[PDB]
Design a binder for these strands. Structure first.
Ligand SMILES: [Zn+2]
Ligand SMILES: [Zn+2]
Ligand SMILES: [Zn+2]
Lengths: 1127, 68, 44
RNA sequence: AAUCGAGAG
């Protein structure tokens, strides 16, 4: 029957009785899923999540005792496990909204256990050494609201359906912004000129792979190519870089000979000349450069000695041991330990691609293309920085032991009291520094995480509107370094981003083209898939093992799983294998092959991308559902996989043999807010972007828990209605629980003449009925301990008495402790009174604001510690009523923003046959330039829905040209008995006569924005120039261009009044010191009667910046013959 | 938070919210017939009863003066 | 007399001391309560 | 008083 529905009964039932089972609209849960999944996989993994793995692989920091080849005893400090602690104390749980009302942080507690092995397995001293309080994530594993019913959430002072990856620190609710980086285990080719500019003989070419350890730790490994003919491996450790020849590492990885390297780089391509000559040049160069380095152990020792302070190696460490450690830790880290046999096999593949890049047989790969892009989640960065801080903490205890050895000379290395002395002298504020990182966004580390930004990783994550709040969790940022970059091509909307990033949702302005948003129904796999058995089934098909036979080059389809070369096969067989693997992945009924397996087969290409089949179990890769034609079952596809897949956007357009997938619901390639726009297929793309940017600026419905949500600003809209033309999935996302805007009876008519460009007019009566009554909630913190220190209680405390404090303060500052809740605070009103003993009298706090407000909620905050004292900490909330005056920006859902031109009186407003007087008037001239047919269609469908009672759905790509929405809604209007085109006849409100033509009138959804400014001064605050600031009663600066405009008109006196309104002898002051009863005279030292000074100085008219300039030059030691004019 | 007075026209509709709910739930109807029997003819009136999110039920159970 | 608990929601009073301590909860957060005070207004 | 972030024109 009906295409959509309001579901009023369901909405009211849900409002009255929150569900006690699985929450409704699950899509929101699997829309905030990536953050929750990341934070859970940080601890909820196969073996201690990722934190235990990371701390296990942190290292074995060792220092040696000075006990007289031996030196003393070791320390072998390690870390065993990291635990969870959500509540806070006699132990009690602490739910969120705490430290929200307190305006503090919602932190957990970090349990840390370490080792004190004095030597190899002799005396191990385990100890739990908890380090501060970790700021945990809401709705995550480490939160009391982990798996709660919506009813339980309602019970625990929480939003009826609350979800969020934001961290509550200082009561600010910040969030880790997502970042997008290179892939994990894929070596790509780069032709950036910076490689050539690195130094002499450097080329533009070079392979790059951003490998990641099983704890998701990045490590770059670049292969620059030199013009002479040698290839130089490059990496980075600490904050610096260290470069080494490639063949050095090739020979160090395994006990393998040069002819084997020849076969590895060139397989059956002996008749090639370019490759063979380049390889022979490389081998001869290595042989002549390092003749002594023959033995594999010898080259290992060479590496160890070349890198001894580079890796902070312990003095008791053999050179072979150090070399093995460095080539196990810093190169091809994603292959892990004991995989050196494959690490040697990977470089032979990486080199051959580089020579293919040199010869041009392979095309480069765009770093900013989504094929090779990849997003790391908030949780992963949290774990990475935590591991870095733990490693730094171990380094710090090592340094403290070193200092004690240097000076203290009181060492035991086997005494618990000694351990206590050591630990008591180091910092255990790991949680505190994590809180600082969340609060500021300033990343500080030694390794640098192979990132590129420094400052800015946490966004405030405001909740102006529910739309903006939910959008905070879907934005992916390219990088602040890219933001500083001025190249346009990075900001292009690449086709490869089809189905992953929203083509529409993008802020307009400076960050345009950068803050992309993921499409809805796009998931990030925050979990390593079961990739163990994949090689086994892969060997089942027709392949060859990576070790039995040697064959390289693009002529053979390389096969690798997450960076492990495992097989080589022809390209035809590679395509067959890719298709069969697709069959078995979507078909199920296979112990391995998870459905979310990103598999990419690049066919052989003429001068194209480098061939070879690829598989990616992945740990942060992007995923996207899509139907699979041969089985009509859901299939998952990634970006790298998509480029060579023949998707069809509709089942209608599925051709023969040119399609295998069809993304059902083509609306899925879009942001949530973009899908919320009605009839996005009838507007102009800039207008769609304007709408997306405007919706996040709305006077929204922040939530329902606003009773206790003390924050800086809320912008709560008092009323609100569902859209009569609501898009489908508006209800499916539970957006109805956060309605904003109102249905307005709009009239596309040029009547008043007070609206030509973008202005609009509201009906004065409709405003008086309360058309839109958004209100502002503002809280600020008031306390007296900001200057108080720990051991010094303040002489001043709340209240007031036993003084001669001014009367009339009991107007609103009337109680023993605080003002009344219900009061109308004017400017300068007594906000709160504190009795002070320092002055032995009470003092009060002024309002210090602009608009008079009403107190909404005053709450008492207690110290987290047992600091009973006198509770010198109070938080109060201001309620501000924002009735829509003129100039307040309203807008529709199509970017047709405008300001309230004038509250047109109802009688003068034009009316219709039915007697309805439209409330919102817009000028028809906007549309021909704006080109938003969506506004017209929304008006038409809104009238039809308001008449028939039904709800109209506005989903893009549901009206074919043969099913025109104009005709579809005209049929409904005709059957309802109204004008087919919506043109309702109307009569003027002043003359009372009928208008020339029937007016286009309908109902549309209208949103109020928060951009509500005027400043004026005559005298007051003041180089003697007026101060800067609207709120400081300042002035306005007359800029240089304003001065030029003053000159251009030739208005000399005008310029003088806008920029305004001496020692006679020296001409470059000093005067006015009367002695007894004489008038003021001059005694300029630079120059009784003239004592010796001078008596030549008279008043002149000059700016008072001149005296400051004179004094500055006097300090500068520079003086000029300032020719003082005569009388 | 039912709009007491019609924004555009001015017909009182605050009283009619409960009646609309009863007519929708107790007796099986549709919204159009429910509004018709309720006595609303112009869509300027029909808005504030066809579309009104009752954000007092969800917004109200967070009472501070009663034990949870 | 005032200062609702906001955790157990019980009215109480202060004695210049231990404003944290809700005698029934001990929760360190207190919330003030509206009293009978005249508040003039405008119906517009 | 400076720095960063949000913006608006
Ligand atoms: Zn002089
Ligand atoms: Zn009406
Ligand atoms: Zn209590």
């Amino acid at each position: 029957a009906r295409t959509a529905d309001f579901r009023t009964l369901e909405r009211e039932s849900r409002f009255i009785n929150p569900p006690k089972d699985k929450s409704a609209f699950p899509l929101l849960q699997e829309a905030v899923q990536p953050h929750i999944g990341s934070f859970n996989a940080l601890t909820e993994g196969p073996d201690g999540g990722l934190l235990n793995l990371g701390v296990k692989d942190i290292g074995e920091k060792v220092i040696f005792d000075g006990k007289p080849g031996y030196l003393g005893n070791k320390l072998s400090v390690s870390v065993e496990q990291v635990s969870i602690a959500k509540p806070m104390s006699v132990e009690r749980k602490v739910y969120p909204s705490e430290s929200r009302q307190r305006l503090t942080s919602y932190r957990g507690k970090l349990l840390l256990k370490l080792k004190w092995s004095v030597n190899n397995g002799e005396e191990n001293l385990f100890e739990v050494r908890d380090c501060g309080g970790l700021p945990v994530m809401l709705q995550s594993n480490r939160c009391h609201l982990n798996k709660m019913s919506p009813y339980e959430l309602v019970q625990h002072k929480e939003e009826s359906d609350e979800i969020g990856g934001y961290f509550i620190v200082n009561g600010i609710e910040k969030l880790i912004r997502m970042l997008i980086v290179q892939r994990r285990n894929h070596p790509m080719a780069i032709i950036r000129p910076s490689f050539a500019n690195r130094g002499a003989s450097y080329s533009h070419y070079g392979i790059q792979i951003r490998s990641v350890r099983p704890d998701q730790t990045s490590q770059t490994n670049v292969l620059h190519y030199l013009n002479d003919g040698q290839v130089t491996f490059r990496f980075s450790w600490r904050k610096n870089e260290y470069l080494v020849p490639v063949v050095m590492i090739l020979k160090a990885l395994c006990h393998t000979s040069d002819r084997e390297i020849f076969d590895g780089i060139i397989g059956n391509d002996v008749k090639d000349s370019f490759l063979t000559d380049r390889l022979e040049l490389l081998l001869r160069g290595f042989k002549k450069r390092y003749p002594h380095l023959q033995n594999r152990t010898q080259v290992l020792q060479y590496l160890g000695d070349k890198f001894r302070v580079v890796f902070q190696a312990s003095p008791d460490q053999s050179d072979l041991e150090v070399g093995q450690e460095v080539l196990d830790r810093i190169v091809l880290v994603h292959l892990g330990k004991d995989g050196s046999q494959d690490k040697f096999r990977m470089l032979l593949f990486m080199i051959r691609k580089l020579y293919s890049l040199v010869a041009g047989e392979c095309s480069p790969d765009n770093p900013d293309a989504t094929q090779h892009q990849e997003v790391l989640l908030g949780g992963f960065l949290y774990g990475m920085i935590l591991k870095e801080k733990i490693d730094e903490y171990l380094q710090n205890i090592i340094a403290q032991v070193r200092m004690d050895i240097n000076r203290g000379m009181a060492i035991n290395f086997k005494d618990k009291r000694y351990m206590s002395r050591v630990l008591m002298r180091v910092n255990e504020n790991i949680g505190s520094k994590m809180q600082y990182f969340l609060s500021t966004g300033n990343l500080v580390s030694q390794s640098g995480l192979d990132l590129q930004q420094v400052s800015g990783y946490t966004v405030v994550a405001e909740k102006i509107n529910f739309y903006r709040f939910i959008s905070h969790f879907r934005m992916v940022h390219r990088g602040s370094f890219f933001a500083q970059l001025k190249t346009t091509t990075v900001r292009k909307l690449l086709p490869e981003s089809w189905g992953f990033l929203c083509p529409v949702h993008t802020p307009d302005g400076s960050p345009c083209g950068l803050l992309n948003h993921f499409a809805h129904k796009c998931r990030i796999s925050t979990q390593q898939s079961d990739v163990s058995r994949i090689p086994s089934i892969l060997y089942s098909l027709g392949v060859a093992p990576a070790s039995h036979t040697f064959a390289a080059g693009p002529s053979l389809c390389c096969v690798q799983i997450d960076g492990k070369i495992i097989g080589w096969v022809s390209h035809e067989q590679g395509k067959i294998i890719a298709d069969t693997l697709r069959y078995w992945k979507v078909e199920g009924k296979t112990p391995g092959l998870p459905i979310d397996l990103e598999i990419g087969y690049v066919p052989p290409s003429t001068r194209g991308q480098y061939p070879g089949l690829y598989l990616f179990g992945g740990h942060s890769r992007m995923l996207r559902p899509v139907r699979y034609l041969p089985l009509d079952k859901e299939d998952i596809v990634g970006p790298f996989e998509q480029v060579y897949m023949n998707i069809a956007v509709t089942p209608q357009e599925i051709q023969n043999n040119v399609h295998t997938h069809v993304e059902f619901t083509p609306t899925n390639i879009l942001s949530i807010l973009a899908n919320l726009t009605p009839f996005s297929d009838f507007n102009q793309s800039p207008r769609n972007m304007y709408q997306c940017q405007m919706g996040k600026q709305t006077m929204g419905t922040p939530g329902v828990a606003l009773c206790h949500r003390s924050d800086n600003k809320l912008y709560r809209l008092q009323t609100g209605q569902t859209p009569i033309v609501k898009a489908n999935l508006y209800d499916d996302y539970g957006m109805d629980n956060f309605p904003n805007g109102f249905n307005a009876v709009v009239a596309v008519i040029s009547y008043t003449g007070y609206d030509m460009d973008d202005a609009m007019i509201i009906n004065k009566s409709a405003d008086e009925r309360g058309f839109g009554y958004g209100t502002m909630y503002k809280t600020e913190k008031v306390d007296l301990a900001l200057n108080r220190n720990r051991g010094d209680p303040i002489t001043q405390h709340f209240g007031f008495g036993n003084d001669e404090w001014p009367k009339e303060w009991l107007e609103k500052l009337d109680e023993d402790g605080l003002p009344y809740i219900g009061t109308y605070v004017e400017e300068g009103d007594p906000i709160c009174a504190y009795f002070d003993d320092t002055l032995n009298k009470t003092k009060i706090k002024t309002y210090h604001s602009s608009e008079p407000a009403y107190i909404e909620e005053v709450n008492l905050i207690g110290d987290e510690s047992n600091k009973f004292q006198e509770l010198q900490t109070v938080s109060i909330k201001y309620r501000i009523r924002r009735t829509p005056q003129i100039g307040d920006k309203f807008s529709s859902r199509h970017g047709q923003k405008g300001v309230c031109s004038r509250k047109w009186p109802t009688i003068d407003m034009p009316f219709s046959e039915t007697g309805i007087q439209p409330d919102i008037i817009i000028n028809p001239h906007a549309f021909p330039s704006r080109m938003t047919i969506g506004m017209f269609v929304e008006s038409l469908a809104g009238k039809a829905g308001a008449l028939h009672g039904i709800a109209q759905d506005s989903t893009p790509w549901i009206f074919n040209e043969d099913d025109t929405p104009a005709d579809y809604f005209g049929e409904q209007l005709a059957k309802a008995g109204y004008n087919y085109h919506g043109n309702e006849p109307m009569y003027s409100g002043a003359t009372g006569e009928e208008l020339r033509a029937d007016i286009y009138v309908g109902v549309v959804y209208y949103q109020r924005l928060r951009h509500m400014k005027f400043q004026v001064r005559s005298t007051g605050p003041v180089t003697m120039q007026p101060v800067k600031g609207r709120k400081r009663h300042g002035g306005i600066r007359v800029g240089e261009m304003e001065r030029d405009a003053l000159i251009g008109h030739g208005t000399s006196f005008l310029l003088q009044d806008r920029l305004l309104n001496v020692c006679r002898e020296c001409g470059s002051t000093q005067q006015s010191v009367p002695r007894i009863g004489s008038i003021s005279t001059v005694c300029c030292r630079r120059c009784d009667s003239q004592i010796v000074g001078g008596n030549e100085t008279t008043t002149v008219a000059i700016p008072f910046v001149l005296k400051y300039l004179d004094s500055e030059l006097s300090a500068m030691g520079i003086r000029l013959r300032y020719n003082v004019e005569p009388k | 938070i039912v709009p007491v007075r019609c924004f555009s026209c001015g017909k009182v509709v605050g009283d009619k919210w409960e009646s609309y709910l009863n007519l929708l739930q107790e007796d099986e109807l549709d919204e159009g017939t429910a509004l018709s029997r309720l006595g609303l003819k112009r869509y300027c009136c029909r808005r504030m009863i066809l579309t009104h999110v009752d954000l007092i039920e969800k917004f109200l159970r967070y009472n501070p003066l009663e034990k949870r | 007399l005032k200062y609702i608990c906001a955790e157990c929601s019980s009215k109480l009073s202060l004695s210049r001391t231990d404003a944290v301590r809700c005698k029934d909860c001990g929760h360190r957060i207190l919330l003030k309560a509206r009293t009978k005070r005249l508040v003039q207004f405008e119906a517009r």
